[PDB]
């Protein structure tokens, strides 16, 4: 229930944003839109591609 226009931040073991390949935790700003209860398929596609050998 947030804003579906923010980028995706990648976090390593530390608290500094780094390269996507050397990342540990994915931070999705929002999934369900706060305007007309929409859904964003970009985030799930990125999650699917990242949850692999990357």
Three-class secondary structure assignment of 1-54 = CECCCCCCEEECCCCCECCCCCCCEEECCCCEECCCCCECHHHHHHHHHHCCCC
Distances (CA, A) of 44 to 14, 23, 54: 24, 17, 15
Q: What is the dihedral of CA 6, 41, 43, 52, to 10 degrees?
A: -160
**Specified resolution (Å):** 3.1
- Method for structure elucidation: cryo-EM
Backbone torsions φ then ψ of 2, nearest 5 degrees: -135, -155
Separation between Cα atoms, residue 49 and residue 54, nearest integer Å: 7
């Amino acid at each position: 229930l947030g804003d579906t226009s923010k980028p995706i931040r990648y976090l390593n073991s530390c608290f500094v944003e780094t390269s996507p390949q050397l990342a540990k935790v994915i931070e999705i700003p929002a999934l369900i839109d706060d305007s007309n209860a929409d859904t964003n398929r970009t985030a799930v596609q990125e999650l699917i591609k990242w949850l692999h050998h990357s």
